[PDB]
């Protein structure tokens, strides 16, 4: 069942390339990695990763949830 992890408070270095690398390191093929928002107030990005199933999403959620990257704590939500 499709599982989407929404992400915000992403520093500049917590970028699409980094997220793609994390998925590759876990042998996970997401349907989509999309960083499509920028918040001027906090100078951070937002977006989502859409996974094929909850099992894949779980592993990346565990890595990212409340992780400090580039000065900002990655903030997540399930859908």
From Swiss-Prot:
Localization (cell): Nucleus
Ranges for domain RRM: 3-79
The protein's name in its UniProt record: Protein PES4
Organism: Saccharomyces cerevisiae (strain ATCC 204508 / S288c) (Baker's yeast)
Gene: PES4
Covered range of the whole protein: 391 to 469 of 611
């Amino acid at each position: 069942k499709i599982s989407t992890l929404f992400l915000e408070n992403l520093s500049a270095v917590c970028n699409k390339e980094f997220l793609k690398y994390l998925c590759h390191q876990e042998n996970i093929r997401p349907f989509k990695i999309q960083i499509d928002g920028y918040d001027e107030n906090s100078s951070t990005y937002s977006g989502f990763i859409k996974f094929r199933n909850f099992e894949d999403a779980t592993r990346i959620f565990n890595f990212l949830n409340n992780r400090l990257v580039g000065g900002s704590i990655v903030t997540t939500s399930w859908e």
